[PDB]
Amino acid sequence: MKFSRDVTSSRRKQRKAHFGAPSSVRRVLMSAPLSKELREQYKIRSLPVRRDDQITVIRGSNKGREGKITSVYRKKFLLLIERVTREKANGASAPVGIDASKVVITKLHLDKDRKDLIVRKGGKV
Amino acid sequence: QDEVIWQVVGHEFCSYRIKGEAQNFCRNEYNVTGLCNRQSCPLANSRYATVREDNGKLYLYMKTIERAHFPSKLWQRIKLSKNYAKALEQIDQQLLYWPGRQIHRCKQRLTRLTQYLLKARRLALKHQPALIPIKPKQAHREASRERKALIAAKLEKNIEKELVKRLKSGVYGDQPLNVNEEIWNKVLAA
Amino acid sequence: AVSEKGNMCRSGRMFAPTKTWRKWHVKVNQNEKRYAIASAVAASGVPSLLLARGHRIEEIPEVPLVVDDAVQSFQKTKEAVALLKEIKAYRDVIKVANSRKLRAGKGKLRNRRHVQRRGPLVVFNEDTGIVKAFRNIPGVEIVNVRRLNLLQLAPGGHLGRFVIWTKSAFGLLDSVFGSTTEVAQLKKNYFLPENIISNADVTRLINSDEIQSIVKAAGPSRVKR
Amino acid sequence: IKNKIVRQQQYMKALHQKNKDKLERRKERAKEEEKDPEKKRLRLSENIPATIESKRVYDETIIEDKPDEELQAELKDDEFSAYFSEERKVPKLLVTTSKRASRKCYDFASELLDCFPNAEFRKRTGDIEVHEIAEAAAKRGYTDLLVLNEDRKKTNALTLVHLPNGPSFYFTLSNLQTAKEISNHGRSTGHIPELIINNFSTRLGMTVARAFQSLFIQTPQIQGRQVVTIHCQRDFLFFRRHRYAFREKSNMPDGIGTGLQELGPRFTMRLRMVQKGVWDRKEGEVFFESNAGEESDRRKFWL
Amino acid sequence: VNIIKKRTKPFKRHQSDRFKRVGESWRKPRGIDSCVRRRFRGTISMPKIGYGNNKKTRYCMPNGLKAFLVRNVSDVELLLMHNKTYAAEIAGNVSARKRVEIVEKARALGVKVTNAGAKVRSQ
Amino acid sequence: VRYSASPALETKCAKARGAYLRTHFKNSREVAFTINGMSLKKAFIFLDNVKEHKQAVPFRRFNGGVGRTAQGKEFGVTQARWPVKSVKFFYDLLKNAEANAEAKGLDMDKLIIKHVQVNAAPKQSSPSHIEIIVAEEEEAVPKANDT
Amino acid sequence: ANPRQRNKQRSGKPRLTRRNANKKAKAKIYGNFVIQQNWDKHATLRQNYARLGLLATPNYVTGGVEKLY
RNA sequence: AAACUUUCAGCAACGGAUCUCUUGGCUCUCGCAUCGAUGAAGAACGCAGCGAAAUGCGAUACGUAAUGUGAAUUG
RNA sequence: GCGAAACCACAGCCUGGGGGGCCAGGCAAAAUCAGC
RNA sequence: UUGAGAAGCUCAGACGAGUAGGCAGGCGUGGAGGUUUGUGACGAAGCCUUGGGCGUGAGCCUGGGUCGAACAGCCUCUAGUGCAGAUCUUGGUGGAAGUAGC
RNA sequence: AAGAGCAUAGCUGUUGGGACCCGAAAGAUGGUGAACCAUCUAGUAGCUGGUUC
RNA sequence: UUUCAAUGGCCCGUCUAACACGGACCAAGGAGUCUAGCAUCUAUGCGAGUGUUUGGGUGAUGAAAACCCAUCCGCGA
RNA sequence: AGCUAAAUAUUGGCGAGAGACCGAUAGCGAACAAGUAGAGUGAUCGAAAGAUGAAAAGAACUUUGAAAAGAGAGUUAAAUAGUACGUGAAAUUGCUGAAAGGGAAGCAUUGGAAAUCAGUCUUACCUGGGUGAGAUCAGUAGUCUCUCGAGACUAUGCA
């Protein structure tokens, strides 16, 4: 259980602060688990999701399709991966929203910011 | 320590009781009759004797006052022989000088556990149909795609499209008998 | 209560609005409270009032179950799951783990979503890690021997709560409740109650030699028609 | 939009523009096609309406009509040979039923026997099993063996075996109709009926469809002009027995189009299991089992 | 003992056939103006304790076995010693798989399951 | 759309429908139950006479104050009238009743009106829903001689 | 519900969230440094004073003191 | 007999109950003390790339600077 | 062509007897319109 | 001879309208604690039914269809807990009628 | 004339509060416009209707 | 179940024989509830006693819960 | 003549944690555009209105039609989810099927005719010999947990 009088357990307060969080909170709520090969070389359980990562999809109907993230859609809480596209009737293709909690990260888009987050948060390069 | 544990569990609340409409039933595993009676409840009655199978072979379970406070070691066990007259003569020699009511139960739950193995063995050896589940999601899908696939074949139209092609190719003798006299000449024109 | 500012019309007020000075709490004399914990602890020493109360203790080695004093310094919860399996109490904890179900109705729109059962109750003496070790096992409640609560010794009103006692708190059961003729030391003017029947078993006097020598000649059972 | 009144006014006005410019796309197209019917052609050769039969999954076992020898080397020497070779074995059917069947299962068991001459009816009595029936029925000059399997006074499934070792097929009847229920029905006669079988592109299509050719007499009387159909369409095996009469119909290009009158029954099957060997539901080897989860795609067909 | 019913037509609240607001479950009339309350002849009858049925052949199906809701596989086990006086009625919300396992075990106990055939098409 | 009629098979039948038609409900019905069960091309010659006052349609059910005519006795009904707005709407539908078999490729000169339906609509007057079924007449093959 | 407080919720500017309320953290000792050492923060005031030698009151206490043994 | 009316059943309409939810209410509790002539609360008008009973903002107008997070926005 | 509303226990034949309904009688055919 | 839920079991007689009123036992609805090693995407609740079953009755159990996420039995606690009616409140829909009428 | 009471809970009753629901002209206070508007007010029954297994 | 036959069957509630008054129908809402005081009966705890909760102490696991209790005091004697 | 903390009050203001509360006619008038729309010259009065789907994949394309739409189609697991969108009750309306109707139906009781439904009846039961299998049998050897023997076993024979 929780033993703090400054955290909330009501579904009302928790389910409002989720669906109406700003687009900076909506970033760390869209995080992905790292692969078992990266979990031991960065010593990080999970990273927040950037654009242009290198992921694989574990759950859902699009199982196992690998790609890179095209447009991290922070509003409707879903990633958008390359070439995983449900068709449309007209002839154009539509993007399929894969949840950011389903994908497994296989290669980070390492930058100066991420490294300065990696090297302090329990790991190294 | 017995009417205490019957005026608590027999009349206020017991987790094994089942409110039937003409009876009440006990969900205990060591009940000899299945009902929540005074002379049947295994919690109030503090010297008890039940018969219950375990993996093919029927057992006899007995308890006493002097082991009541040791719930692990409370029930002892005797394995009952296959010969039905031997088992009755082995219940009595173990349940001697116990009340006649209790030994009556064990012998009746020996007749009732032997009839269960003598039936479920014959029942297992017969060849009987397979009870397979129906599924509402996959019988509403069939009914949906049936009429969408029944009208999407023009069932009557494709019959007649080849039926004349079966005629016009001439799989029947030149002048057949299933055709009238006039329209065959149109096939001759064809 | 509804806000204070015709009950048949729509948009109208509700008939006789509920009011916050409803009697929500209720007084009970301290000697009937002190009687209930006395009675509900005795039920925790009866191996058959625990089964009927819905506990899977059908493998426990003894009742009342008194583990040693070293259990008060258990630090990690994998040193508590260790204990509850050697003494075969873990079948109760599995009864609590296997049996959470979503609350039937609008309790779950109201911050209570998950009903479950009540596992063992661990009564300690000194809090040297025993509370923090056991407090993340389903079902297990931990209380000091002095501040024993009735809502945990008879949850729902049904006596026979499975209590696992600690040796250092089993000793303090004679200074919190005392005896029937001797004052409990941790309570001013407490004496344990006595009984309206001296022998707790009334169908075993009737069959004694004191009664069945004097009684008149018996009739039959259910009579013939 | 979290409102409901705004959401169906903002959409009403949005639709009434999408319902306007579609006419504005087709009005300007309307004037150039009657000046130039050649642009009318291309579009028609371009935008043919797409349908499920045209947007199938690409399955490589669609046997083309070009005769490849490895096909006809197989199926000229199988156990269906006697009903396809020069011998032309007239197949003698045995139609049993499920155990302890009811009245509503027996009036359907006369409608199939209307379809099938050279077919007896023998109600299953007491304790006998299908594997023991097949060996007991092959010794008396029988070829195939149907089993109508009702439940709760409705017939739901049908299995036919092939004797003495042939493939055994477990369909399930659906959308069942009798001969009385159909509007504008007809009387059947003693004439042996004629066959048509359509759209069995898959190789397994030409394994079931031969086991449906195997129940009918290999040369029918034509005086009755009776036709029986086995039309696969989206993996449903439609069964419709008709009686025809050729009459002039100007719409279809030959000018002569017949008119059908149904006889009954009207049932429709799936395909669930296929076993080479007599049908034992637990002691058998599966030639093809129906995956009830890989048929979700309406563009995936196995028949 | 052969089962018997003192009545077979249930009772039907007065004028619950004319009006659609008034339901058919019985409600004793409360007015002394009533024709029914004073029990005028020709009007409908009433539930009384006279129509109570035999205290031994009560709750029995026309076969003779009383009913019993078995909602899981260990609720039919209690009926082991009572297979000639109880019929194991399966509850309605039980899944079409947990149902097919009660039937295969109640059949070993010789217990009549009244609606074993639901959701279970046999092959 | 899920229609109200057991007929209208894919074989020899076609359907159209018209929803939210801003006419009266008690006026298109008596038209609808007159044209029902008739052949298609005859119904066209029938209703155009209503448009030129050459034939009146009887008012059987909703016969409120309908004056007697001389031609209402062709069917035996006392009262009849010449509605023009409602039969204008039916002509629009029956064009789609044709032009749907014209796309399915049926036989047009055996085409009867099988099932005409007239319902109500969500009130804004008394608007209407209409669905129509046109079907071929389900001919009969002569029986083969004897066996 | 209120005109002031309909305003912030219908807006999109976060509330001035100030988490400033947890019990059971009894105020740590300043003023003196020796008593800061021998204080144990969980134990209540009257159990610290009458452990390390001092009184909370020189007068009478108007309640029944705790008895643990 | 057909029609019409009534009754039953099936289907299609009407209609929005029941059931399930719930960024809302209502109630109790806890911490805190902070509007204005240095122009408050309120009003009007404007400002969005495409905005329409809404929001934010003031011609630096759906805001700039400074810090922090760290690569989005979205129709 | 558009198109209400009031009103609405269920209703609708007469004679006599205790009113539309009860008792005993006269009788009794659809579906409608105009005076009344 | 087992019929010890001694709150059970059993034997025998008489009795049976009922107003104001008095007494007793039960049925059902929303939430709360305990319990059913409780039911549920193989379809929970609801809803419909020319299906079956129980109770004297309030009611309950169930087959079929529909449907799509939760729900119930038992022992207690609790109440905003039961509708035919109030020229009842809100909503929906009828006959008068395609009449009155423009 | 060798004390029987105190406390808690439940039932029914009784008074007092809005007091089973609804209906019954009033007056006051403060305003708007040249009578109306809120508020006390949940004004007033001896009484009229209704009051749910 | 639908219907037929035979026989019976004055429309419901409020009123005070008929009436009158209410009723077009369907759905959801909708009426002896909360609190204080007094009295009776019953239950329980203690008993010449009885009553913890104004407060104080305590409560690491909803710490508004539970638990403990000084000095008065109320009712009775 | 004057000042002064703390204990105390707090339907408002800035936050916070809860609840045996209401669950879209309820709970604030206001879950949604709400003191908004709208009404009054004015003070003031003041509503109705939540839910497609997991993902809009919100129906390409062909054709009739001036339009609206309709039909073929097509997406979906579901269109028996098409923005008149979760489930979709009753009144009430139209069609179809079967009935009934001589200036009253309605209901109750006993039965005819039509339709239809259920019942375990499916099979089970019980009795000898012979053949094979072993186990609770061995004029038998071992292990473990409990308490000499009581169960669980592993061998080997199956007398």
From Swiss-Prot, chain D:
GO terms for molecular function: rRNA primary transcript binding. Residues 18-39 have a biased composition (Basic and acidic residues). GO terms for biological process: assembly of large subunit precursor of preribosome; cytosolic large ribosomal subunit assembly; maturation of 5.8S rRNA; maturation of 5.8S rRNA from tricistronic rRNA transcript (SSU-rRNA, 5.8S rRNA, LSU-rRNA); maturation of LSU-rRNA; maturation of LSU-rRNA from tricistronic rRNA transcript (SSU-rRNA, 5.8S rRNA, LSU-rRNA). GO terms for cellular component: nucleolus; nucleus; preribosome; preribosome, large subunit precursor; sno(s)RNA-containing ribonucleoprotein complex. Residues 13-46 are annotated as: Disordered. Residues 91-280 form the Brix domain. Signal peptide: none annotated. This is Brix domain-containing protein C4F8.04. It comes from Schizosaccharomyces pombe (strain 972 / ATCC 24843).
From Swiss-Prot, chain E:
GO terms for molecular function: structural constituent of ribosome. Its main location: cytoplasm. GO terms for cellular component: cytosol; cytosolic large ribosomal subunit; nucleus; preribosome. Keywords: Cytoplasm, Nucleus, Phosphoprotein, Ribonucleoprotein, Ribosomal protein. It is found in: Cytoplasm; Nucleus. SMART domains: Ribosomal_L32e. PROSITE patterns: RIBOSOMAL_L32E. One of its GO terms (biological process) is cytoplasmic translation. InterPro entries: Ribosomal_eL32, Ribosomal_eL32_CS, Ribosomal_eL32_sf. PANTHER family: 60S RIBOSOMAL PROTEIN L32 AND DNA-DIRECTED RNA POLYMERASE II, SUBUNIT N (PTHR23413), RIBOSOMAL PROTEIN L32 (PTHR23413:SF1). Belongs to the eukaryotic ribosomal protein eL32 family. There are 2 genes for eL32 in S.pombe. This is Large ribosomal subunit protein eL32A.
Swiss-Prot record, chain F:
This is Large ribosomal subunit protein uL22A. Gene3D superfamilies: Ribosomal protein L22/L17 (3.90.470.10). PANTHER family: 60S RIBOSOMAL PROTEIN L17. There are 2 genes for uL22 in S.pombe. Component of the large ribosomal subunit (LSU). Mature yeast ribosomes consist of a small (40S) and a large (60S) subunit. The 40S small subunit contains 1 molecule of ribosomal RNA (18S rRNA) and at least 33 different proteins. The large 60S subunit contains 3 rRNA molecules (25S, 5.8S and 5S rRNA) and at least 46 different proteins. uL22 is associated with the polypeptide exit tunnel. It comes from the Eukaryota. Component of the ribosome, a large ribonucleoprotein complex responsible for the synthesis of proteins in the cell. The small ribosomal subunit (SSU) binds messenger RNAs (mRNAs) and translates the encoded message by selecting cognate aminoacyl-transfer RNA (tRNA) molecules. The large subunit (LSU) contains the ribosomal catalytic site termed the peptidyl transferase center (PTC), which catalyzes the formation of peptide bonds, thereby polymerizing the amino acids delivered by tRNAs into a polypeptide chain. Belongs to the universal ribosomal protein uL22 family. The gene is rpl1701. One of its GO terms (cellular component) is cytosolic large ribosomal subunit. It is found in: Cytoplasm.
UniProtKB/Swiss-Prot annotation, chain G:
It is found in: Nucleus, Nucleolus. It comes from the Eukaryota. One of its GO terms (cellular component) is nucleus. It comes from Schizosaccharomyces pombe (strain 972 / ATCC 24843). Residues 1-23 are annotated as: Disordered. Its main location: nucleus. Involved in the biogenesis of the 60S ribosomal subunit. This is Nucleolar protein 16. Component of the pre-66S ribosomal particle. The gene is nop16. Belongs to the NOP16 family. GO terms for biological process: assembly of large subunit precursor of preribosome; ribosomal large subunit biogenesis; rRNA processing. Keywords: Nucleus, Ribonucleoprotein, Ribosome biogenesis, rRNA processing.
